[PDB]
Amino acid sequence: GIPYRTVSEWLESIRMKRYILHFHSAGLDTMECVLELTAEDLTQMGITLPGHQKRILCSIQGF
Numbered sequence: 001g002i003p004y005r006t007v008s009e010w011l012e013s014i015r016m017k018r019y020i021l022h023f024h025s026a027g028l029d030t031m032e033c034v035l036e037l038t039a040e041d042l043t044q045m046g047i048t049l050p051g052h053q054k055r056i057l058c059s060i061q062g063f
């Protein structure tokens with residue numbers, strides 16, 4: 001990939017679309033915006049549950 005074309009498609013595929021507003025209000029609206037995200041970025045974004053951070057960060061590493 002990137003094997004996803006939209007942030008929304010990517011999040012849905014990893015079952016984290018519950019965090020879609022968190023990504024948009026932090027101005028991350030394309031796949032290229034997310035490639036270098038860290039657990040610190042997620043926390044600051046309000047995504048703090050560790051298994052969810054892991055789900056998201058593992059997915060990006062898997063691209």
Ligand SMILES: [Cl-]
Pocket residue numbers: 030031032033
């Ligand atoms: Cl993109």
